[PDB]
Paper text:
The crystal structure of the lamprey VLRC ectodomain (residues from His25 to Cys247) was determined by molecular replacement at a resolution of 2.3 Å. The structure has a horseshoe-like solenoid conformation, which is typical of proteins that belong to the LRR protein family. Lamprey VLRC is composed of eight modules, including LRRNT, LRR1, LRRV1, LRRV2, LRRV3, LRRVe, CP and LRRCT in this order. The concave surface of lamprey VLRC is formed by the β-sheet made up of eight β-strands (two from LRRNT, five from LRRs and one from CP); the β1-strand is anti-parallel whereas the remaining β-strands are arranged in a parallel fashion. Like VLRA and VLRB, N-terminal and C-terminal caps of VLRC have a total of four disulfide bonds presumably important for structural integrity: two within the LRRNT (Cys28-Cys39, Cys37-Cys52) and two within the LRRCT (Cys200-Cys227, Cys202-Cys247). We calculated the Shannon entropy for each position based on the multiple alignments of 102 Japanese lamprey VLRC sequences and mapped variable residues onto the VLRC crystal structure. This revealed that variable residues are located predominantly on the concave surface, in particular in the region around the core β-sheet, suggesting that, similar to VLRA and VLRB, VLRC recognizes its ligands through the concave surface. A striking feature of lamprey VLRC is that its N-terminal cap has a long loop protruding toward the concave surface. This protrusion is formed by amino acid residues 41–48 located in the region connecting two β-strands β1 and β2. Indeed, ∼80% of known VLRC sequences from Lethenteron japonicum have the same sequence, NKTDSSPE, and the remaining ∼20% have closely related sequences. Crystallographic analysis of VLRC confirmed this prediction.
Evidence indicates that variable lymphocyte receptors (VLRs) play roles equivalent to those of Igs and TCRs in the adaptive immune system of cyclostomes. VLRs consist of an N-terminal cap (LRRNT), the first LRR (LRR1), multiple (usually up to seven) 24-residue variable LRRs (LRRVs), a terminal or end LRRV (LRRVe), a connecting peptide (CP) and a C-terminal cap (LRRCT), followed by an invariant 3′-terminal region. Recently, a third VLR, designated VLRC, was identified in lampreys. VLRC sequences are more closely related to VLRA than to VLRB sequences, leading to the speculation that VLRC+ cells are T-lineage cells and that, like jawed vertebrates equipped with two lineages of T-cells (αβ and γδ T-cells) and one lineage of B-cells, lampreys may have two lineages of T-like cells (analogous to αβ and γδ T-cells) and one lineage of B-like cells.
Numbering used by the authors: 25 to 247
The structure:
C-alpha cells in the first residue's frame, strides 16, 4: 500500500483534488505510520503526516514535491532532520515540526523555503540553533520556538526576518548569566512593538523575563 491510488483516490491516506475550500491534499494524519509512505502524487499541495509514529524521515522523501505549500510533520517521534530534507520545496508556506524530539537542526535546512510564512519548532528539545538558519526566511510571519532547551540564540539570528509578526520564545532555559543573552535581550526590547509574543521569554525557563534583565554585570562574562 502507498499514500494514494491517485490524486483524488485514497489508499493509506485520504487524497483529495484541489477544491474551492481546500488545496490538493494528502491526509495521512492519525494513521500510526512508522514510515513515510510512497505514492505521494507529484502535484500534492498539502501533505499531512502529523500525529503518527515517524522516528526517521528519509532524506529524499519530499524531493520533487514542487507544489507543496503545506507540510505537517508535527506530533511524531523525530529525533533529527536529514540534511537537505526540505530542499526543492520552493513553494512551501507552512512547516509544522512541533511536538517531536528534535535536539538539533542541520545548517541551511530552511534555505530553500523563501516563501515560508509559518514555522513551528515548539515542544521539542532543541539544544541549540545553527547560525544563519533563518536568514533566507524573509517572508516568515510566525515562528514558534517555545518549550525547548535553548540557552541562547546565535548573534543576529532573527535579523533577516523583516516580515516577522509573531515570535514565541517561552519555556526555554535562557542563560542570562553570560554575554550571549544580550542579543536576545536587545531584540525583544526593540521589537516588542512590531513583533508579538516575545515577552514571555524567561531566564532559566521560568524566572526573570529576559527583556527586563540587567545586562551590565554579565556584559563581559563570556559564555
Amino acid at each position: 500500500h502507498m499514500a494514494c491510488l491517485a490524486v483524488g483516490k485514497d489508499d493509506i491516506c485520504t487524497c483529495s483534488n484541489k477544491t474551492d475550500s481546500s488545496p490538493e491534499t494528502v491526509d495521512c494524519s492519525s494513521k500510526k505510520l512508522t514510515a513515510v509512505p510512497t505514492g505521494i502524487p507529484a502535484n500534492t499541495e498539502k501533505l499531512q503526516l502529523d500525529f503518527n509514529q515517524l522516528a526517521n524521515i528519509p532524506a529524499e522523501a519530499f524531493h520533487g514535491l514542487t507544489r507543496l505549500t503545506y507540510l505537517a510533520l508535527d506530533y511524531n517521534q523525530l529525533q533529527s532532520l536529514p540534511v537537505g530534507v526540505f530542499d526543492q520545496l520552493n513553494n512551501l508556506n507552512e512547516l509544522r515540526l512541533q511536538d517531536n524530539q528534535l535536539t538539533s537542526l542541520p545548517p541551511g535546512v530552511f534555505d530553500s523555503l523563501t516563501k515560508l510564512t509559518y514555522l513551528t519548532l515548539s515542544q521539542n528539545q532543541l539544544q541549540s540553533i545553527p547560525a544563519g538558519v533563518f536568514d533566507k526566511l524573509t517572508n516568515l510571519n510566525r515562528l514558534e520556538l517555545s518549550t525547548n532547551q535553548l540557552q541562547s540564540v546565535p548573534h543576529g539570528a532573527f535579523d533577516s526576518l523583516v516580515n516577522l509578526e509573531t515570535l514565541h520564545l517561552e519555556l526555554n532555559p535562557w542563560d542570562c548569566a553570560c554575554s550571549d543573552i544580550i542579543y536576545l535581550r536587545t531584540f525583544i526590547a526593540k521589537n516588542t512593538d512590531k513583533i508579538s509574543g516575545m515577552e514571555s521569554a524567561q531566564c532559566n525557563g521560568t524566572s526573570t523575563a529576559v527583556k527586563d534583565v540587567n545586562t551590565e554585570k554579565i556584559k563581559n562574562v563570556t559564555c
